[model samples]
Target: DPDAIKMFVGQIPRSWSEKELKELFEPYGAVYQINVLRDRSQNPPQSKGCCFVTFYTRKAALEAQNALHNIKTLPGMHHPIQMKPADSEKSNAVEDRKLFIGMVSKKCNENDIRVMFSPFGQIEECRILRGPDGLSRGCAFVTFSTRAMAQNAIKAMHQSQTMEGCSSPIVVKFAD
Candidate 1:
């Protein structure tokens, strides 16, 4: 089962394709599942950034972990991602809800936005506008279920809270 596989990975670059990712670890053991979390707001054929991989057995996961540590998935990006057991629960309670967020930093991406607001409430969507260069435009649209949740988040984080990994504060508002 996923819980028995004590390996997890995070912070993957969106550039890596599924084939590339699977090729990286498949050599070690049978891969059970590969979930590359997509940007909910992406137009279609979403980018691949963060992902979770499951292996057949704990020992297989450990073996793969040892092989992957210190390996660089992307050139010039030296941070090595981690691996650990997967969540056994079918769903996290928060996913059932949604909220709307706005005023995201230009330098941050959807993953960054999720990490920022997830603690406050279940973020339904974090949409960051991008240009031809795929750069953030200093603004985003976040959605949450229940306006009350969104309002509470806005009150707590509006202009007052500093966004992580950016030099700007977030602006929260109703999605539409």
Candidate 2:
């Protein structure tokens, strides 16, 4: 299937959430997974980000990379995402998860957001955009390690959902 064929992505900033990365690539093609590698031994706090992705297909992957390459995702946020062909030999099943979620609850925080998807797989991170008052800005981003895991999460989360009372429609997308 075209969806099984994943692509390569790089130069993702550590601070960028999985959701943000997914949203960045949503316009191009379907992204199956997002992987931001970090040191497992690091304690207390982990590293910020950079990552790779596996798109659903070669054409989709190429298109996505071209559209989003060198694009700055967040305002003042540097480090444009890089996309390439994922090496099949060097990649693993658990290395291909990713999803972008929006319409979050203003009251939601990072910890709770992470907890929300923890049951599906190893959540690399959860990021909630905040306002000057330190409240969730009705959106957040999350990432997983494989397509199956990401699909699993989407199966449970894919809906016009919001933690807050906002009735606006939610959007979900995948990074390259």
TM-score of each: 0.42, 0.42
Task: Please write out the lDDT profile of model 1 over residues 1-176, one tens digit for every residue.
Answer: 64446355765677776677788778888888777767767577675566677777767788887767656455435587665555753343333334445455566778887777776667666777678686766777666755567667777888876655556666766544
What are the per-model numbers of colliding residue pairs? 17, 19
lDDT of 2 by residue, 92-133 (tens): 543255567777667767887788778888877677767768
Candidate 2 regions off by >4 Å? 1-96, 131-134, 169-172
Per-model C-alpha lDDT, please?
0.66, 0.67
